[PDB]
Design a protein around this ligand. Structure first.
Ligand SMILES: [Zn+2]
Ligand SMILES: [Zn+2]
Ligand SMILES: [Zn+2]
Ligand SMILES: [Zn+2]
Ligand SMILES: [Zn+2]
Ligand SMILES: [Zn+2]
Ligand SMILES: [Zn+2]
Ligand SMILES: [Zn+2]
Ligand SMILES: [Zn+2]
Ligand SMILES: [Zn+2]
Length: 347
């Protein structure tokens, strides 16, 4: 493969520095998929990573959940400016009478935290948590990246379509996107393809409330590259195509990053500095005020215990990259490697 040396040059240093057991990389250019596989999915079996290996992609799941939400909008089941309690009777009489579905989707409802409190570990406790939650910021004014926020968005989008979230994803949305090996619940027949994650102590590990919606997808580099293709070349189904397009619209910005539904976007060519800043600890962990929204690059990071994922693509240039690893290695390393490889592809 004439792209192998370029991809290897940016990826092999990551593997060495962070002792990454395995990584599946996929690149799109000129309508063609290219797969570059490294190391092992499972240190016990020694099974090689391939483009069919399943990795936990963590928050990259949010792009898929966002697409389901957009699909519900396209189907007329909900609108982004609906109050959240329209789709959850159990939220009636709370502050979620005054917070919109779009605000949940874009982490801007007013300071919902990164994670549920550890104690919130059941349906009953989760409903209680939202009903007692006290806003920190006015709706729309601040971005605080949040699993409870987008998790609730996805959960309520599923409810608006009158089906369970996992079923909608596995039976309708994901196969509609050409993603037939993408799961919230990995079935028996797919378990042999499922990597283990590796913690910092090299312990094998795999993945709470709204996990499915917020961070629970297992998928392959082949399936995720198919999703990238869907986000560039499109899909056959008109409703899904319109849904995908809704996920590209900018809602607001934080520095040089523009927040949409799931995807976070940048003007392209993008400097490494701009891409690092929008993916920085400050943006991920702290509340930041929302500013007016901005060729475009779209991306999403995701991590779980033992896993580290990144996807970035540029529709105007027909290029994209997926990097799925079974080590949670630092986001800036992901960004720098992707930026370098994409720049080589862009020419
Ligand atoms: Zn090489
Ligand atoms: Zn190739
Ligand atoms: Zn065993
Ligand atoms: Zn529910
Ligand atoms: Zn299928
Ligand atoms: Zn597949
Ligand atoms: Zn589940
Ligand atoms: Zn677009
Ligand atoms: Zn919005
Ligand atoms: Zn650049």
């Amino acid at each position: 493969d004439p792209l192998r040396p370029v991809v290897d040059a940016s990826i092999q240093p990551l593997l060495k520095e962070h002792r990454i057991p395995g990584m599946a990389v996929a690149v799109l250019k000129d309508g063609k998929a290219h797969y570059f596989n490294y190391g092992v999915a499972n240190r016990e079996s020694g099974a090689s990573v391939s483009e069919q290996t399943l990795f936990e992609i963590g928050s990259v799941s949010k792009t898929l959940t966002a697409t389901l939400g957009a699909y519900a909008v396209v189907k007329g089941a909900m609108q982004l400016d609906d109050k959240a309690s329209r789709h959850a009777p159990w939220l009636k009489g709370s502050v979620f009478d005054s917070i919109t579905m779009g605000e949940l989707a874009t982490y801007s409802a007013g300071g919902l935290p990164l994670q549920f409190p550890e104690e919130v570990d059941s349906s009953e406790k989760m409903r209680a948590y939202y009903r007692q939650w006290a806003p920190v910021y006015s709706p729309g004014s601040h971005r605080q990246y949040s699993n409870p926020s987008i998790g609730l968005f996805g959960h309520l989008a599923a409810s608006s379509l009158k089906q369970p979230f996992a079923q909608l994803m596995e039976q309708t949305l994901l196969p509609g996107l050409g993603m037939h090996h993408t799961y919230v619940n990995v079935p028996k027949q797919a378990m042999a393809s499922y990597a283990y994650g590796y913690s910092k102590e090299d312990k094998p590990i795999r993945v709470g409330m709204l996990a499915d919606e917020a961070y629970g997808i297992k998928t392959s580099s082949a399936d995720l590259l198919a999703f990238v293709k869907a986000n560039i070349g499109g899909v056959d189904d008109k409703a899904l195509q319109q849904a995908i397009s809704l996920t590209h619209k900018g809602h607001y910005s934080v520095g040089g990053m523009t927040q949409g539904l799931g995807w976070e976007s940048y003007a392209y060519p993008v400097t490494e500095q701009t891409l690092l800043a929008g993916n920085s600890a400050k943006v991920i962990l702290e509340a930041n005020p929302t500013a007016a929204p901005r060729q475009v690059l779209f991306n999403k990071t995701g991590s779980s215990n033992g896993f580290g994922a990144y996807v970035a693509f540029v529709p105007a240039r027909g290029i994209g990259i997926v990097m799925l690893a079974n080590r949670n290695y630092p986001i800036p390393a992901r960004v720098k490697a992707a930026h370098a490889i994409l720049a080589q592809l862009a020419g």
